[PDB]
Design a protein around this motif. Structure first.
Motif, short mmCIF file in Angstrom:
data_model
loop_
_atom_site.label_atom_id
_atom_site.label_comp_id
_atom_site.label_asym_id
_atom_site.label_seq_id
_atom_site.Cartn_x
_atom_site.Cartn_y
_atom_site.Cartn_z
N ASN B 221 0.86 -1.21 0.00
CA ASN B 221 0.00 0.00 0.00
C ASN B 221 0.89 1.25 0.00
O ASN B 221 2.13 1.10 -0.04
CB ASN B 221 -0.98 -0.02 1.17
CG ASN B 221 -0.29 -0.05 2.52
OD1 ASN B 221 0.84 0.41 2.66
ND2 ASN B 221 -0.97 -0.59 3.52
N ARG B 222 0.26 2.43 0.03
CA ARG B 222 0.94 3.75 0.00
C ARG B 222 1.26 4.25 1.41
O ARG B 222 1.76 5.39 1.54
CB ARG B 222 0.01 4.76 -0.69
CG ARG B 222 -0.39 4.39 -2.11
CD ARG B 222 -1.25 5.42 -2.81
NE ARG B 222 -1.22 5.24 -4.26
CZ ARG B 222 -0.30 5.74 -5.10
NH1 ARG B 222 0.70 6.49 -4.65
NH2 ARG B 222 -0.39 5.49 -6.39
N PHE B 223 0.97 3.46 2.45
CA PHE B 223 0.97 3.93 3.86
C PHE B 223 2.24 3.49 4.57
O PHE B 223 2.93 2.54 4.13
CB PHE B 223 -0.26 3.40 4.60
CG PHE B 223 -1.55 3.50 3.82
CD1 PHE B 223 -1.83 4.61 3.04
CD2 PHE B 223 -2.51 2.50 3.90
CE1 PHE B 223 -3.02 4.70 2.34
CE2 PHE B 223 -3.70 2.60 3.20
CZ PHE B 223 -3.96 3.70 2.42
N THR B 224 2.52 4.15 5.69
CA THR B 224 3.52 3.71 6.68
C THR B 224 2.85 3.76 8.04
O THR B 224 1.65 4.11 8.11
CB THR B 224 4.83 4.49 6.53
OG1 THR B 224 5.81 3.75 7.24
CG2 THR B 224 4.75 5.92 7.03
N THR B 225 3.55 3.31 9.07
CA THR B 225 3.04 3.34 10.46
C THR B 225 4.24 3.49 11.39
O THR B 225 5.35 3.65 10.90
CB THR B 225 2.17 2.12 10.77
OG1 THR B 225 1.59 2.40 12.03
CG2 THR B 225 2.93 0.81 10.84
N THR B 226 4.00 3.44 12.70
CA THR B 226 5.03 3.50 13.76
C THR B 226 4.94 2.19 14.54
O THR B 226 3.86 1.63 14.56
CB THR B 226 4.76 4.69 14.70
OG1 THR B 226 3.65 4.30 15.51
CG2 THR B 226 4.46 5.97 13.96
N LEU B 227 5.99 1.77 15.23
CA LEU B 227 5.94 0.56 16.08
C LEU B 227 4.75 0.66 17.03
O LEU B 227 4.00 -0.31 17.11
CB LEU B 227 7.25 0.39 16.86
CG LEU B 227 8.23 -0.64 16.31
CD1 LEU B 227 9.33 -0.93 17.32
CD2 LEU B 227 7.52 -1.93 15.91
N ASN B 228 4.57 1.80 17.71
CA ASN B 228 3.49 1.98 18.72
C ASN B 228 2.12 1.87 18.04
O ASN B 228 1.27 1.14 18.54
CB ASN B 228 3.68 3.26 19.55
CG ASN B 228 4.81 3.19 20.56
OD1 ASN B 228 5.31 4.21 21.02
ND2 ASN B 228 5.21 1.98 20.95
N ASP B 229 1.93 2.52 16.90
CA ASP B 229 0.63 2.52 16.16
C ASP B 229 0.35 1.10 15.65
O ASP B 229 -0.76 0.63 15.82
CB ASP B 229 0.63 3.50 14.98
CG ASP B 229 -0.64 3.40 14.14
OD1 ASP B 229 -1.73 3.51 14.74
OD2 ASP B 229 -0.53 3.16 12.91
N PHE B 230 1.33 0.47 15.02
CA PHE B 230 1.18 -0.93 14.55
C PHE B 230 0.74 -1.82 15.73
O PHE B 230 -0.22 -2.58 15.61
CB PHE B 230 2.47 -1.46 13.95
CG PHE B 230 2.27 -2.89 13.51
CD1 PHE B 230 1.62 -3.17 12.32
CD2 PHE B 230 2.59 -3.94 14.35
CE1 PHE B 230 1.35 -4.48 11.95
CE2 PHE B 230 2.37 -5.24 13.97
CZ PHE B 230 1.74 -5.51 12.77
N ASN B 231 1.43 -1.68 16.86
CA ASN B 231 1.26 -2.52 18.07
C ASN B 231 -0.15 -2.38 18.67
O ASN B 231 -0.60 -3.35 19.30
CB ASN B 231 2.40 -2.27 19.06
CG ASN B 231 3.65 -3.01 18.65
OD1 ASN B 231 3.58 -3.91 17.81
ND2 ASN B 231 4.79 -2.67 19.22
#
Ligand SMILES: NC(=O)[C@H]1CCC[C@H]1c1ccsc1
Ligand SMILES: NC(=O)[C@H]1CCC[C@H]1c1ccsc1
Lengths: 304, 304
Positions: B221-231
């Motif tokens: 996809n076109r997105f990224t995330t953060t360890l905390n947000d993913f978690n």
């Protein structure tokens, strides 16, 4: 309990794997008695592979051009012949690890174990099926050619597959141990499209019996069907037509579970028409078709 | 190309499997050097298994009560000791087929190969993972106890698992080769529930890298995330929390593919939130968590 995609113990085949080198090309050979079996494209440069004349390429090759290594000991080649798409290299020493073995040409839908190998060294083992389009969905990198598919009956290894080629669609084509390709494939770097990869209906049904035996029963319904009615549904979903032969083969699973083959066909019909609605069967979210009825009986009864 | 659930070649372990019989109970043992390792419940009647006092049961047993057969040749037992939940039977003959080997206690999420065995005879081989609840999802019938899990590094077999017990939920519990159970399980026929079977997030991500390498890319996809947000997402879906350790381990797959770990995490987040919408990844309709990052590198590079 539990149901696993299970390969045969690979030990007996491990003892047969050797490295074959011709000029700059290395791949795997199979050493049985005093013969090493390998793909004939061992004699090719990847340049040759665009349009090879194997007979002409082989005139240029002598016994001493075929470097055959079993572990770290060189085998002496005293003879070479082309049979179809394999080379047979006569060596001066019988493989002391030669198991009881047969060469068999399997039918599509039949399952076997692949011992993937590089430089004559085993990397791993997985269960495959011959697809109805005569391809296999393997795991093969450069150097894996000559890796072999096999079944074991107690102490007898039935070799059915030698790996030759990856199609541009990343599916795999190969021969029996007489060097005849499964399907219409040739050992040439050319336009080769696989036909329709149909689902192996009798295998899916066997797998549904395996699920019932293991407690996954949510998909059993109140319905039955007929071979002809089921087969209309199977046509629609690119499933292989179900024959009375397939019904007879499923007999023992039918008897064990007390679920008539045609009832199970009606369960499969609903699963095809309705999907699994986000549920799983034996930890799969799709219908598995790479267990045969024989595979289900063997795993579910514990044959060694 | 292609990606397969691949087991180690089982040959080296085949050569170590023996039958152990004590009174009426037969199961499998592992013969390394002059010691046969087997589950201590070999000394039990299924009546004993409700509340066994192994120390008391073992007082009644002598060396000559332990019948150890390797093929069709009897091994002479000159010594027996209980270590935790295994018996060590000293025999008068070193197994000539003893490979280089280590005993290792694996961490949950770690994968290994099981050689399922009955009466000391191998039936088949499959790849497993230690679940985060310290169970394994195996394929084991009566007589399969003492079957072993292992990894191979070139020529060294690291034994990690010996099979002891099926939970009433049809999942499998066992020990390391020092006889210590993985998880809180005891060798007793009693109420033992497994905890939450969480998904092994780092393994799912490794498998997504394997998919990208093999041409299955629809889920990028076109997105990224953060360890905390993913978690937060992972918590919601009973995925193991992702640590910086997991990110570091995924580094080489990240480098090979040029897809930052956190970008792939955002692809996994969308797949968790949106599901696969009837699509597949490496021929799976769910997220596979029984390949480690090491497994993906090994299969995708062709280590032998
Ligand atoms: N399609 C392929 O596998 C090619 C790449 C490496 C081998 C070569 C080949 C072609 C026809 S037979 C072997
Ligand atoms: N739950 C099980 O596997 C029982 C059935 C056969 C073995 C027996 C057992 C129990 C605790 S250790 C071994």
């Amino acid at each position: 309990s539990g149901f696993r995609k299970m390969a045969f113990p690979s030990g007996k085949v491990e003892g047969c794997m050797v490295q074959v080198t011709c000029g700059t090309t290395t791949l795997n050979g199979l050493w049985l008695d005093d013969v090493v079996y390998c793909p004939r494209h061992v004699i090719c440069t990847s340049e040759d592979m665009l349009n090879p004349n194997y007979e002409d390429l082989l005139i240029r090759k002598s016994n001493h051009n075929f470097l055959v290594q079993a572990g770290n000991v060189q085998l002496r080649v005293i003879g070479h012949s082309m049979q179809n798409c394999v080379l047979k290299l006569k060596v001066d020493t019988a493989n002391p690890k030669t198991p009881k073995y047969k060469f068999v040409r399997i039918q599509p839908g039949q399952t076997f174990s692949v011992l993937a190998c590089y430089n004559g060294s085993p990397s791993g083992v997985y269960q495959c099926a011959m697809r109805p389009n005569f391809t296999i969905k393997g795991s093969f990198l450069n150097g894996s050619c000559g890796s072999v598919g096999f079944n074991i009956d107690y102490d007898c290894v039935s070799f059915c597959y030698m790996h030759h080629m990856e199609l541009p669609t990343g599916v795999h084509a190969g021969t029996d141990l007489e060097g005849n390709f499964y399907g219409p494939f040739v050992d040439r770097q050319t336009a080769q499209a696989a036909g329709t990869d149909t689902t192996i209906t009798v295998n899916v049904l066997a797998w549904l019996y395996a699920a019932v035996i293991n407690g996954d029963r949510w998909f059993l319904n109140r319905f039955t069907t007929t071979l002809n009615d089921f087969n209309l549904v199977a046509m629609k979903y690119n499933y292989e037509p179900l024959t009375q032969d397939h019904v007879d083969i499923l007999g023992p699973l039918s008897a064990q579970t007390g679920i008539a083959v045609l009832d199970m066909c009606a369960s499969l019909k609903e699963l095809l028409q309705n999907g699994m609605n986000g549920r799983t069967i034996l930890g799969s979210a799709l219908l598995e078709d790479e267990f045969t009825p024989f595979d289900v009986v063997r795993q579910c009864s514990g044959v060694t």
